Write a protein that binds this DNA or RNA. Sequence first.
DNA 1: ATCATTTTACTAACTGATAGCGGAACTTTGGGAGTAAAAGAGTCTCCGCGAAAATGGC
DNA 2: GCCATTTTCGGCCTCTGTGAAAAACTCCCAAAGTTCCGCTATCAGTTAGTAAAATGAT
Lengths: 1205, 81
Amino acid sequence: EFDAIKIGLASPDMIRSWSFGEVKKPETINYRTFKPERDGLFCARIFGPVKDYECLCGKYKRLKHRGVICEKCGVEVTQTKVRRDRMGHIELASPVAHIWFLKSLPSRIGLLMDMPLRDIERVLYFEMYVVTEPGMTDLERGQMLTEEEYLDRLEEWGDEFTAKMGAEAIKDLLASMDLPAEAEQMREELDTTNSETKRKKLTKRLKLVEAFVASGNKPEWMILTVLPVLPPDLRPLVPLDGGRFATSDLNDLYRRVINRNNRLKRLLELAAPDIIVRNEKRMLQESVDALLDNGRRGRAITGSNKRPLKSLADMIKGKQGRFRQNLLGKRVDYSGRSVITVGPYLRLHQCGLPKKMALELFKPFIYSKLETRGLATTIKAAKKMVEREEAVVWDILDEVIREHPVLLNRAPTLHRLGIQAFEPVLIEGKAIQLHPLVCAAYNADFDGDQMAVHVPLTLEAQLEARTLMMSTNNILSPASGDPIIVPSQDVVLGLYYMTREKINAKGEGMYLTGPAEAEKAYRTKTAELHARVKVRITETIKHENGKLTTETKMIDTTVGRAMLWQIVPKGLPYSLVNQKLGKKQISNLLNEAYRKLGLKDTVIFADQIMYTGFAYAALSGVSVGIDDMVVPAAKYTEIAEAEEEVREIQEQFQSGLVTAGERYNKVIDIWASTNDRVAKAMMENLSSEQVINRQGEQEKQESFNSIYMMADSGARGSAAQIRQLAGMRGLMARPDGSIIETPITANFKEGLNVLQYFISTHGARKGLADTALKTANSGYLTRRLVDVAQDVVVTEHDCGTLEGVVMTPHIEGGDVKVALTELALGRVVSEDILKPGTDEVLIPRNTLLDEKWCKVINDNSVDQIKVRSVVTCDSDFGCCAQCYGRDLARGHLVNQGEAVGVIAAQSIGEPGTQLTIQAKNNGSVKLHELTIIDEFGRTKEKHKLPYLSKADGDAVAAGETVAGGLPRVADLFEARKPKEPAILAEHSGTVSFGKETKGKRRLIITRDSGDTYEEMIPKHRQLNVFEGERIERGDVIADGPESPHDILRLRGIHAVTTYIANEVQEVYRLQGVKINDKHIETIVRQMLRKCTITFAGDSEFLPGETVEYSQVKIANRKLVEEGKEPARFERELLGITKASLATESFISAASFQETTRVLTEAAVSGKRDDLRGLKENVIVGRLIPAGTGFAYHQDRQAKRAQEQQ
Amino acid sequence: ARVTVQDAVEKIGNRFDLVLVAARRARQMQSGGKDALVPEENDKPTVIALREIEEGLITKDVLDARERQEQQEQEAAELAA
DNA sequence: ATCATTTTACTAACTGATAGCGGAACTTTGGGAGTAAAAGAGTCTCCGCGAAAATGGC
DNA sequence: GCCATTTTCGGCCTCTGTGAAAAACTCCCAAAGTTCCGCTATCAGTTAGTAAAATGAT
Ligand SMILES: [Mg+2]
Ligand SMILES: [Zn+2]
Ligand SMILES: [Zn+2]
């Protein structure tokens, strides 16, 4: 229907064209008949009838008279919904300035007229004059005159000049302006200007003037003469129960405006004294400003609630505004909500749904099937049968929901795994039954949690739920690629208990034919689950090439391990099950099953694992008791020793040998050491036991303590919590953060006293409050990331670019932090991976690096590779499939139309709640910094080189001595400037001292061409440079935090990308959160979307102008094809908020935040919204250009071009 | 009945294109009079279309081909009138 | 295949009622003008927020 | 180039009416509103009558 949204200024003729009449009276409804009043805010002659196909008279009261205007009233006989579309207008007695174009900084009227806002307000506030036509007088246009001065020059010259007050003066000045003449004069002045501030001022004014000329808008339209009036049904006055009426504040504001306008007209009819007329005009201006934007001009007008009235700007803007409350998010039909329970019998794609709840949700389908089979003749009969709840209705409901997917969603939806598709199963109850394995996906526990359900209606939606959103497809985490359906708690505990080993168990040493005989022995009470036996295992390996090799051999194992192998699918080794299975082992089993067998086998294996774990956790009988918490006997001795030497050092303090701070420090140190010793003793006492073996001797066995088993299996608990239960609680902090000297020397088994409990509450309250605030911080950060990256969609397959980023193992000392395999998993090779010291192409170009090639690289021992990245992509809009790589949630190359930006933003923002020189290897030494490289050719040590035992290339043996998170991520993504940034070498040359100017110092640098560049530096700076040294570009002069803008300007795109990725990943890896770097590079690419033009060239770009990089790239390509001088640009780094607000589309910018500024800029410029992103299509209700809509949108674009031909 | 839409995405390659093709086939079988090429086995049109795609009987090529065929046949029939 | 009769299709008339429209008169409501000692500067309370960025002023 | 005052932002679900004060009569006139009566259009109910078609008997 429509392809673009055009915004701009509204002319009075256009406003009259919109309006269906003029509102002349502030009347709303009669107080007796409750009927609209003529020429009022609710007039039926202007806005439409209040009853369908009726008139206020009642003479025309049926449909035969449609479109006929009653002669007695004037009300057109039509539908009432026209009252939601029909507009009105008010003919204002005097012009009023638009508040948005006057007080939204920068003031557009002041910018256009080159006058300060204060002077314009003084003219508007009726204080001092302004000259409109100077005439044949020394007076100049736009200069300000006091009343006394006005009288003097009026007695002097008389009618030769015209000087006015108010918005009439501003409109008579704006209309007298010649935009082309001003543009030419300011172009000439900018050509012969030198000052930078003046350059900025007139370049802004020139941009505004050229925008006005290009858009076709007139400046005088910024002063309102005709005021449009909203449809009554959008500002309704409707009766409540009990005779009360509910009204909108817009009615009060409109009534005020109409009353003041009518009073002004009456005063002008009476030939009023001037002062009263000026007061009335001020009141009219104030009323119009309050109606448009209340509180911006001055004191906000309040009603009878002592609370400010809500205006149109408040109605369209804010968190509670239309954009965020009704356009980007809506309340929907065919939805429900219920508490969630656990269904251990369900399959991974099944969810338990109440029968009544499904009956209410699927009611139209039940009607359709009740008529199709002839059980109900008409829809009323079907409704009656559904209401009476007959058995055939239940059968119809069962047939309806058979293969109909349903959507389950839990708030908050941090990532896309928070909404999934399941097959409903009717259950007797009122609570939704949920599969346990999806709980980690939902972050849901059964302590009162509620989940919402949605019913996809169309066939397309059902197939989308079945194919994309089904739980069986979403078993890999899109943030990392690791499995997300890993077992936890009871399943892990059962698999751990069954796979444990016991010494001298019943049935030890027996020989079993296989898992079936092991199960038979277990059920017959012949052998225990933990008896060491020898089992004949038939084991099949599916190799990388697809070879299926079956080997039958006898393996030493336990009965439980074979019984668990009974459910392991074919194609996996027995070594995965021939061990005690914690959370890590089961996760590895599931990952191997996915990587070697597929998805269906993985789903069945996960279901069987959950069933077996639940069953054998039930059969285990694991229980927590007061005897399971064994406090070590060494704890009391250690406490006594610590207290004694505390007494000794207190005596030392009374002697003056040490200060109070040293005493505090060593008391804290000893208390930490004693806590560590007590924890070690308790862990040793809890982890082991002595048993009698077959020979009769005493053997060492791992303990079967319930708490120890819970902690070791990884189901629930850790070493720290066991330490608090059976050891020491440790030192705690004061509310400010300082650590109390005396720690809690008691655990929870013995019990704390009053003081220790109070100290514990000190930190518990801090933790709870920190969680509460960090949740909101993470939500805001995620929203900003989504709004900055929502436009990134995979649009092509290959962009044909040779650029890429270099990838090496991440080294932070003598050990590797992350391997090259982890970073290269799923990336496309940019240049061929040659074998070290050889010219053989091991891995060719444009090949995805999967597990096989990762193993190949690890075996070959390749150190540095180059891969394609989203930041270096050449795609005009979005990115291409190859530059992105494997999609972590699916395992293959990313498909066309994937909204990778939203996935990246969600992946980064979801863990926000969790967020708060001696050589050690044998090899050679290489200098660039200090690097130690092994004999295989891998760099295994990286260390800094402050300004040595071995020289470059000298072999070094082992042991030789050569000699806070979430705010950090927020500032990193916002490109925040550090308070004390590091001074960086702007240009390459030799350093030279200069005049030590008072206040702060100056320095100079001599380039290769002899040009001297001056640098301004503060006094308090520990300089690293020395005179006579040629410092390279990007060398550090003053140490400190590095500004990302400086890194981008002086090092390049790759350097800033690496810096941001490394810092964000350091913050995340400190907490143990695994997030792929392509997400952070999809955010960094969005940051680097603007360029400032340095060389204008012949393209339509001005120097000092910030424009989009893609447009400049296309313009440069066109100019090169035309053989004309191309443009030169300097890429700019913007934060996520500024990049979000600097988008080409104004709908998305207005929907994000600061609607007033965005709308004002779009209106003055006359911007056009092409609806190319997700948010615009969501707001206008069209298909998003991502996924299943992608092809659709593509088709339209083709037709566009084909028609434009 | 069917679960785990793997074979279909292997035959098609792209999940979204598969969704669109299956939606077209299901609309043909439900709104139109077209019959299934596989035993129904008490399955909804979406499941039948997915099974047909898995068996290789239905692709985008086939659908567009037979749609153009129906337009040609209808044009010839209207000429015959 | 043909005749005679009942039912069908079509006019007229009377009964009785009911709703709608128009005119006369009365009560109810609604808008407007007037009030002559003199009276001749407002509120109106609050203000328990912090951090970062974008505009004037020098 | 640097203060100094504005400007705008601050997670997702579910229930969940509010506010409450505050100061005129008096007279005159025209228009809307209520009620009543008369005229007229329209219809449901019933009967009678006449001419013709359907139909059964022979
Ligand atoms: Mg909970
Ligand atoms: Zn009317
Ligand atoms: Zn690319």
